[PDB]
Amino acid sequence: DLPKSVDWRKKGYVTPVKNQKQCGSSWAFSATGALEGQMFRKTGKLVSLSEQNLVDCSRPQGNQGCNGGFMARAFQYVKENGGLDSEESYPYVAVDEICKYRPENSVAQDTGFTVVAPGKEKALMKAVATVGPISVAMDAGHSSFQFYKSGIYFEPDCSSKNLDHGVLVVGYGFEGANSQNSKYWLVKNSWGPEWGSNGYVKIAKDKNNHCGIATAASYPNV
Amino acid sequence: AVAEK
Ligand SMILES: [Cl-]
Ligand SMILES: [Cl-]
């Protein structure tokens, strides 16, 4: 019995929109967004986490910094490392740099991560309703996504299998009175608040896993 | 993906 709509931004779980600039680090922003919501659920405090800590330090786990990476490998790094620094103490500079992780500045931890059933939008909906914001991969390789402005995004050129961008599902919704009318996923991007709808995009929901949103979803266990 | 400049 899941809610007809969810929006974690309205419960305090989501930090203001960030900007990855010219660095292939969307996976790091999707991972800090998910950990930010789980740490808030655990402590009641919303603390911005360091994407640069992940960019610089998680190559042992398989990430490649500004050249790409995966949210699961980020949650694996946080677990093996024993922590993750705050954004304030380890600022983002959008280029690969030397790892400067400082344990004394850690404000988050995880014990591992949970994988949502691949390809299953109903498993993703259950995770979003019961856990908090969820890290997901999607195909953002389209001019229509770069210039998205408002409304429910639906792009026929979208692939559900070949993905290139890590984002955060912070909720889901519908329009009008019928909960099944015009359903959408509420997605936080990391291209600045100026992109899209104050930094977010509504992606069509329950339309055959549009853009791959439920193909490779996960969240950290705290 | 990165925003196009
Ligand atoms: Cl990226
Ligand atoms: Cl991943």
Numbering used by the authors:
A (entry chain AA): 1 to 222
B (entry chain PA): 444 to 448
Quote the study that presented this structure, word for word.
Addressing the elusive specificity of cysteine cathepsins, which in contrast to caspases and trypsin-like proteases lack strict specificity determining P1 pocket, calls for innovative approaches. Hence, we set out to determine the crystal structures of cathepsin complexes with representative peptides of cleaved substrates. As a working model, cathepsin V was chosen because of the resolution of diffracting crystals (up to 1.3 Å) and crystal packing with accessible active site cleft. Reactive site mutants C25A and C25S of cathepsin V were used in structural studies.
The pattern III group (binding shifted to the primed side) consisted of structures of eight non-protected peptides that all bound uncleaved into the primed sites. Electron density maps in the region from P1′–P3′ and partly P4′ of molecule A enabled an unambiguous interpretation. In molecule B the electron density maps enabled the unambiguous interpretation of two further residues, P5′ and P6′, of the peptides AVAEKQ and RLSAKP. The second exception was the peptide AVAEKQ, which formed an internal H-bond between the O of the P3′ residue and the amino group of P6′, instead of to the side chain amide group of Q21. It also formed additional interactions with neighboring molecules in the crystal. On the non-primed side, the MPD molecule occupied the S2 site, and the CL- anion occupied the same position as the carbonyl oxygens of P1 residues in pattern groups I and II. Its negative charge appeared to mimic the absent negatively charged SG atom of the reactive site cysteine.
